[PDB]
Design an enzyme around this catalytic site. Structure first.
Site, short mmCIF file in Angstrom:
data_model
loop_
_atom_site.label_atom_id
_atom_site.label_comp_id
_atom_site.label_asym_id
_atom_site.label_seq_id
_atom_site.Cartn_x
_atom_site.Cartn_y
_atom_site.Cartn_z
N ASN A 212 21.18 20.09 -10.47
CA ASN A 212 21.53 21.48 -10.77
C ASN A 212 20.33 22.17 -11.43
O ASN A 212 19.88 21.75 -12.51
CB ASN A 212 22.76 21.53 -11.69
N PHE B 215 32.49 27.07 -12.05
CA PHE B 215 32.52 25.83 -12.82
C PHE B 215 33.35 26.12 -14.06
O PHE B 215 32.87 26.77 -14.99
CB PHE B 215 31.13 25.32 -13.19
N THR C 258 -4.76 -4.94 0.98
CA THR C 258 -3.96 -3.75 1.16
C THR C 258 -4.69 -2.73 2.01
O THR C 258 -4.05 -2.00 2.77
CB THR C 258 -3.58 -3.14 -0.21
N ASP C 259 -6.03 -2.72 1.94
CA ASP C 259 -6.83 -1.86 2.80
C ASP C 259 -6.55 -2.15 4.25
O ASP C 259 -6.52 -1.24 5.09
CB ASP C 259 -8.33 -2.02 2.50
N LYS D 295 0.82 -1.19 0.00
CA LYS D 295 0.00 0.00 0.00
C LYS D 295 0.87 1.26 0.00
O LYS D 295 1.82 1.33 0.76
CB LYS D 295 -0.90 0.00 1.26
N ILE E 286 29.17 20.96 -8.31
CA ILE E 286 28.29 20.32 -7.33
C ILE E 286 28.95 19.05 -6.78
O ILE E 286 28.84 18.73 -5.59
CB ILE E 286 26.91 20.05 -7.94
N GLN E 287 29.69 18.33 -7.63
CA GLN E 287 30.43 17.17 -7.19
C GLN E 287 31.35 17.54 -6.07
O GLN E 287 31.44 16.80 -5.10
CB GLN E 287 31.26 16.58 -8.35
O1 AZA Z 1 28.60 21.48 -10.81
C1 AZA Z 1 28.45 21.10 -11.97
N1 AZA Z 1 28.74 19.82 -12.32
C2 AZA Z 1 28.60 19.42 -13.58
O2 AZA Z 1 28.86 18.30 -13.89
C3 AZA Z 1 28.11 20.29 -14.51
N2 AZA Z 1 27.90 20.16 -15.86
N3 AZA Z 1 27.38 21.33 -16.32
N4 AZA Z 1 27.38 22.21 -15.25
C4 AZA Z 1 27.82 21.58 -14.16
N5 AZA Z 1 27.97 21.98 -12.89
O1 AZA Z 2 -7.05 -6.69 -6.46
C1 AZA Z 2 -6.82 -6.40 -5.32
N1 AZA Z 2 -5.73 -6.94 -4.68
C2 AZA Z 2 -5.48 -6.63 -3.42
O2 AZA Z 2 -4.52 -7.09 -2.90
C3 AZA Z 2 -6.36 -5.82 -2.73
N2 AZA Z 2 -6.36 -5.35 -1.44
N3 AZA Z 2 -7.43 -4.52 -1.33
N4 AZA Z 2 -8.10 -4.51 -2.50
C4 AZA Z 2 -7.46 -5.30 -3.37
N5 AZA Z 2 -7.72 -5.58 -4.67
#
Ligand code: AZA
Ligand code: AZA
Ligand code: AZA
Ligand code: AZA
Ligand code: NA
Ligand code: NA
Lengths: 303, 303, 303, 303
Positions: free
Chosen positions: B269, B177, B66-67, B6, B242-243
């Site tokens: 970025n 950069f 799942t209910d 769920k 950023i690296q």
């Molecule tokens: O920080 C950055 N890393 C990158 O790899 C990059 N490539 N374009 N600009 C960038 N700036």
């Molecule tokens: O098809 C379903 N599978 C499930 O496991 C389920 N649980 N609630 N309703 C459901 N319907």
């Protein structure tokens, strides 16, 4: 209807003039903005009766390319000497109408792209970094402006609005929703104590458009302050509904900012569903996400 | 491959036992978690050779709905007496295998649903609210666990990993950069000073699985501390790539937490494109969003 | 782990060589692709021991810039003389390893950006336009390829996988889910006739990598044909669970395509909640969207 | 402003009354809908002076709970005997105003949740399945309806609009954009032959609200037919701009559907960037995704 324009014009400016000289309120420690990083997403719409043949005949003679509108906005953010988004929109609108004589109307939306302070160790102590900022996807300020050219070639602002968008607040207790209509369509139980979760979009209009620009900052209403009023009032209030809450928020906003003419709210209810009500030897509970349907409210409070 | 489970099992718990007694580090003021509001999104996967005929013959005799898995998780969050997501996953996994004898393996993922403090005026002063929280869509903690049942019905953790996801950091200056390969495929100019914007996903594994649960909190490694190391090192470093940066972050993490065996990085970025380089009488510039292609890096540092 | 690369490398080619002569199967009309518009989203990852100092020392001398890898991919789409994404990936992989001797490993993911025909009135009658196409956000074909450089300087494909992603299918009648475990955690009512709504991601491997390229289209297995088997089998079957359904889809796939070595399924359950059980004077019912949690299944059928 | 409501009210009806007998047009094959599966996403907004104290005093006595409005909609989908979303909206609006006398205004938005036929081998041959359908995330029909209660207790529709949303069309050849203004802000190169990629949202109004309901299908204008006019016209036209294109689409629509009073367009430009201008021994080119900013146009054609 006839207009065209450009959307999602992102523009990031470094070292804009700082906003200071703000008038404080009890609900907020907001004292200004550093503006080391100033981010805005701008939408621009332009119209004018002389655009007709661009639609009816494919004649581009009077078409400002939307690509050129993007260039216009971004260039003007570089030259802007003000301190607010509202002021930036005014700069753009006035400049654009003075450049393009055949445009009779411009509408602009600016949405803040917000960043948050981070901290670094240097010189032997941990302190706020002036270089590294965290991009936020939470609430943000907004601004709206419409300007028109008159027959005598003067320009007038015809509508202005500021706002705060994307505010998501949950109050774990101290909310009720009872007394509503119970008829053949009602299956919702009355709840004495729910964890109200609301999405808030709050917009405000000034009595005098000039107070929105920040040139005299003491008259500016900051979105940050509106945020803080909303959180404080939601805390203070034994809410009876979301309707009840946003009216009280609006009241507090207009009391704190007598220069505002009105405040408008768009709220949404996203309250979780209860799963576990009783937990032995503990005041906790467990909740989970609801089905998609959400209630909402739209409400204006006037000064 | 054969398993089922769920996803998007959201569970919000109030008043979980607070996390305190943490061992501090210079890069972070983190001192624990209040746990007034504890939110988790849980994915569960279960397997076992006795599930075969549920696929090959449509025989549901040994199928936990799942209910029902969703019910299991949510109920166990109500009874959980621990203080971490890692500990919560262990609680769920051990309980689930002891309940269902025909399941040989369980895999769990928990992702924090983070909330932020808000402030309210009350009793004559503004202070942090114990009731109103702001839902955050920014970075969040994560946890991963795999448990298996052996032939003698004992249970073993076979893999554990913790992490921080959704960290978005921009450094406006102090990044280069240069020196990369320049051939018939290179059109990228060398840049002496760029506003590096990186997305960071950082995961770490412990030397001893028990240190991840928080039962002895002094040995716990908090995602908040990892966040603060990353922001501090990015500030401190004249980055060459950023690296280059994530190696230095990993080094600092393993130096601060000698109980960690390794740290793994997935970076992206998202640096903006320059539009305006020179602004008269000002050190600012204007940038804008790039085209969609993003560079990325995956790198492990070992103790 | 140590690698780096580029993601979201969008590339749109017009008038690729058409795919023709694919052997048909009775479940599908598919015979080939016109390739007037050929759109792909590529992700490239490269590894090599010689990349170490790029991380540990910030030495970029042996760094192919991720931007250059984007150029490499987009230029190679312009020079590709083949007819499949799988063959494109091999073209790119082989060319890249031959170009950069310091790279020991390249991994490629390609995802189709699908388009659909539209109607246009040509000679007084509607026909499929050769010019106008609709961008689809529904299912799409996928491909995956890893290639290495061996000790003796030869290149070898270490892994290849094709797939179909984003298939969302709902069968209104003829599905049951009964006989599953009922215990203290079970609340799901048995259902003898449910509108089973499944998300499907299907991936297949070939007995002979050669067949993936489409050079001999008689041996090529198109995602479109997999889509049609899945929908036919789901129609033909009184399903007993999603598990039962995907096992049967896999068996049919392998019967129709004996060159395939295996088929892998990743399925999710998104069946709606029933709101109205019986409507007067009709066989119809009303449903609505469920809460977020979704079941999932993962299973591999082998030839 | 003062109103409130419910959004994202998903409702799926099986075996709605089929829509039959719609008058065809030469651009489209469309003649009706089988309605084996009828899916709609509804948003409801209600207003009324009697709602004031729900905000100003927290009095819920005259609050229909938003949850109840969801029940109201979903039950009414079960009892609707009509054949269109437009008619569903009227059914809901009329029933809601009749039920709740304190409401003066209801506004409804309905968005189709579209599904597509799939192949199944029935009697030894592929056919459209009557059971299995594919959920589509492409274009969908829309409807909008406002209704009020007058002074004399009569109800009146104040506004009605149908539409088509989410249409994404790309024409590989036969599009120009030239002759636009070139000045200090212009960098966009003129293009005599571009692969114009447009997003389209088209909305139409009827001369007679009655025709929207489909009670007399001869007068009903289906979104499917609007889709096909748009694609035919875009194929037929050497476009000079998006503006030129949408004006021509609107003219054709109004010629084919004389009962329509107007057609409204909201169009966006998402044309790709060209990477490879000429490919040896082929008519093909290579493109990639642009930066985020997108042009947009808004224009209304009237009968
Ligand atoms: O920080 C950055 N890393 C990158 O790899 C990059 N490539 N374009 N600009 C960038 N700036
Ligand atoms: O098809 C379903 N599978 C499930 O496991 C389920 N649980 N609630 N309703 C459901 N319907
Ligand atoms: O605050 C609320 N207002 C409402 O109108 C509503 N309706 N359901 N729940 C609700 N909560
Ligand atoms: O069709 C177009 N109209 C426009 O207004 C425009 N501006 N840039 N590109 C454009 N294309
Ligand atoms: Na200050
Ligand atoms: Na503390």
């Amino acid at each position: 209807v006839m207009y065209y324009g450009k959307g999602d014009v992102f523009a990031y400016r470094t070292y804009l003039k700082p906003l200071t000289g703000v008038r404080t309120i009890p609900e907020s420690p907001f004292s200004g903005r550093d503006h080391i990083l100033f981010g805005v997403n701008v939408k621009i719409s332009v119209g004018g009766t002389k655009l007709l043949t661009s639609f009816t005949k494919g004649d581009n003679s009077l078409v400002v390319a939307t690509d050129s509108m993007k260039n216009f906005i971004q260039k003007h953010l570089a030259s802007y000497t003000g301190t607010t988004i509202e002021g930036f929109l005014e700069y753009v609108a006035t400049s654009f109408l003075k450049k393009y004589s055949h445009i009779e109307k411009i509408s602009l939306i600016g949405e803040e792209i917000p960043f948050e302070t981070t901290f670094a160790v240097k010189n032997g102590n941990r302190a706020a970094s002036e270089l590294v900022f965290k991009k936020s996807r939470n609430e943000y300020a907004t601004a709206y402006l419409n300007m028109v050219r008159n027959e005598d070639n003067t320009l007038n602002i015809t509508e202005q609005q500021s706002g705060l968008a994307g505010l998501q607040l949950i109050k774990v207790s101290g909310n009720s929703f009872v007394g509503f209509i119970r008829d053949e369509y009602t299956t919702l139980p009355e709840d004495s104590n729910r964890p109200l979760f609301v999405y808030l979009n709050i917009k405000w209009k000034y009595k005098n458009t000039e107070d929105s620009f920040g040139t005299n900052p003491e008259n500016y209403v900051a979105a940050e302050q509106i945020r803080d009023i909303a959180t404080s009032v939601f805390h203070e209030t034994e809410t009876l509904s979301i309707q009840h809450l946003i009216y009280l928020i609006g009241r507090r906003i207009l009391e704190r900012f007598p220069q505002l003419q009105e405040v408008y709210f768009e709220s949404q209810n996203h309250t979780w569903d209860k799963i576990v009500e009783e937990i032995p030897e503990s005041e906790g509970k467990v909740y989970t996400e609801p089905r998609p349907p959400y209630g909402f409210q739209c409400f204006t409070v006037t000064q």
